[PDB]
Amino acid sequence: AGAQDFVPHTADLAELAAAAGECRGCGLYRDATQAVFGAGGRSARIMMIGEQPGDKEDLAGLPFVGPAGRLLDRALEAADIDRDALYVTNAVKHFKFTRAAGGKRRIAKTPSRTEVVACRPWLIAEMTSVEPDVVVLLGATAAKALLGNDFRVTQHRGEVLHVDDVPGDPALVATVHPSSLLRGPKEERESAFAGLVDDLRVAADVR
Ligand code: SF4
């Protein structure tokens, strides 16, 4: 099933990342430039999971390098969370996209639940390798990957969650994806930014 046979029997993140470059667990490896594995080290206490690598990530080979990554950096700084404590990754590891004539970027397309479930073996390997105390789920795709396809991020803000089939029973905090805070009226963006900082502080205060 899915990516499972492509995942080697190791918790070494460099070896896992190299193996993900050879993954054919769903169709997304075909058009993407490369797999984008998570970044950070196994001592990280906080793991953060987004949806997928975007246009800039697909070419950088690293998660959270675009405008949404810069906004997340601003929120992490505001939450007094250092990168040293972080392992950051995405629910799926290959960019799914299309282009529009006149566009200034490749347009991210939503991974199907089928793709998320196919790629989940990599997320499980990362979680087994890092043993985080807390997992921050950025957006619906990531939150549903671990909490269920019916899960609604909008209904559980600020809440520390724990589910049974997650490796190591870490705390889980589901929040908005930073990409959503880039647009909208100023007062709504400012209120949303504050709520993202609040959710990051909840996660950082676990244990
Ligand atoms: S998105 Fe995940 S399962 Fe699909 S080919 Fe890429 S690494 Fe494999």
Residue numbers in the entry: 2 to 208
Paper text:
UdgX excises uracil from uracil-containing DNA to concurrently form a covalent bond with the resulting AP-DNA. Structurally, UdgX is highly similar to family-4 UDGs (F4-UDGs). However, UdgX is unique in possessing a flexible R-loop (105KRRIH109). Our earlier studies allowed us to propose a reaction mechanism of UdgX, which involves the formation of a covalent bond between H109 of UdgX with the C1′ position of the target deoxyribose sugar concurrently with the uracil excision from this site in DNA.
Substitutions of His109 in MsmUdgX with Ser, Gly, Ala, Gln, Cys and Lys showed the loss of its covalent complex formation with DNA but gained canonical UDG activities. However, H109 substitutions by Gln or Lys, showed poor activity. Both Cys and Ala mutations of H109 showed intermediate Kcat/Km values. Further, the overlay of all the structures of UdgX H109 mutants showed that the overall structures are very well conserved with a Cα RMSD of ca 0.2 Å. As anticipated, we note a clear difference in the sizes of the active site cavities in the various mutants. When we arranged the mutants in the order of increasing cavity sizes (left), we noted that the canonical UDG activity of the mutants increased with their increasing cavity sizes to begin with and then with a further increase in the cavity size, the UDG activity declined (right). It suggested that the initial increase in UDG activity (H109K to H109Q to H109G) occurred because of the efficiency with which the water molecule could be localized to make a nucleophilic attack on the C1′ position. However, a further increase in the cavity size (H109S to H109C to H109A) perhaps destabilizes the bound water, thereby decreasing the UDG activity.
